[PDB]
Write a protein that binds this ligand. Structure first.
Ligand SMILES: CCOC(=O)c1cn[nH]c1
Ligand SMILES: CCOC(=O)c1cn[nH]c1
Lengths: 216, 211
């Protein structure tokens, strides 16, 4: 069974929920997901986890010491350490398929200004490290990106190109709008053709990059 | 004050949590977020929300009569309707900035196989509709994508290029590794030039597509 550990200063936010895809996986016994409060590894009364950046700039950077103790306790040399960040290598469907065979994923959630770089540098001396982006926008912390990665990966676990065109179900006419009649005909070959053409025009319009063309 | 309505068959999973950024905004009174269970608008005892695809194929497609009623109740002509889908236009930082000044966002979460296309086509005749992808991977449903979109938009509400390089804070030395000396130099022109070169090298290595 696969084990996923998540580390965050917002533990309530990432606590697993029974009625969800990861919730079902856990219940089928196919995965163990544990959430850890980063503040468990702090010593001071005020339990501080970040500080102003060396060299100046906005916001705060998470301290290396606290992350060091957390990952020392949670990770082994076998661990794949996942770190969401706007500056990461791209997380894609290939990435999801690959991670779906892993024994132990640890996901380190940190603020967007970053965890002190020495943390990832240190971890890399003992385990495989993957800093990754799920897309080109900014989140305040890695938490929401962790939830996307967990969804993408777990649905590919055993036992759990081109854009898709429009899809339709009953009734065949609704508010004066009809389902494309080819879909009603039962001709497998004609239906395959119409769907291919629909996918072509959608991909060219919305995602020309996928077909090897310049973006808008 | 911004209003966000989220429509889903997984209401617990999407319930706001106090200990989060969206939870802070809500308690600060900068947004009101409302989560609705789609099953509220079903017709039968089974609370059916999908049905087999015309033309055949795997998976199921969400019913137009059910989503139709739900959006009639929730949306107004001022609504910007958001539909996460792998087939969408890309959601980017530019998109988040645009939506951050909207009065009413409604986010329709469905399974990845899709919602009957006539729902969006119908809605687009009396309100603004945006189908968007948050990245090139497959989720079972739009729920996690909605959390990401809400996160990116809300942090841009008042009150709540190249890649960024490495960042550092105290202590100066840790486990045999020193913060790069130039950052403690007090030469802020040189610091900006060093950070630009770090950004350039990191972008070459991790995202060469951005050049
Ligand atoms: C630490 C925050 O991380 C992000 O904002 C992100 C991750 N992927 N895309 C954006
Ligand atoms: C309705 C399911 O939505 C997705 O799978 C998705 C959205 N953006 N990237 C993937």
């Amino acid at each position: 069974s696969m084990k996923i550990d998540v580390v965050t200063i917002f533990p309530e936010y990432l606590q697993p929920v029974r009625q969800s895809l990861p919730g079902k996986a856990i219940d089928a016994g196919l995965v163990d997901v544990a959430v850890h409060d980063l503040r468990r590894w702090t010593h001071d009364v005020h339990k501080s986890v970040d500080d102003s950046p060396y060299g100046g700039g906005p916001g705060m950077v998470m301290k290396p010491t606290v992350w060091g103790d957390a990952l020392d306790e949670i990770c082994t040399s076998e661990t794949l350490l996942v770190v969401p960040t706007p500056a990461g290598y791209p997380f894609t469907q290939e990435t999801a398929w690959q991670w779906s065979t892993e024994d132990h994923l640890v996901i380190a959630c940190g603020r967007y200004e970053g965890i002190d770089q020495r943390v990832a540098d240190d971890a890399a001396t003992r385990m495989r490290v993957r800093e990754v982006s799920i897309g080109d926008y900014v989140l305040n912390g890695g938490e929401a990106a962790a939830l996307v990665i967990i969804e993408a990966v777990l649905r590919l676990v055993p036992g759990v190109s081109l854009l898709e065109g429009p899809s339709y179900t009953r009734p065949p006419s609704w508010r004066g709008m009809d389902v494309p009649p080819v879909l009603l005909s039962g001709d497998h070959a004609k239906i395959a053709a119409w769907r291919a053409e629909q996918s072509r025009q959608r991909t060219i319009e919305r995602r020309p990059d996928l077909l090897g063309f310049d973006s808008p």
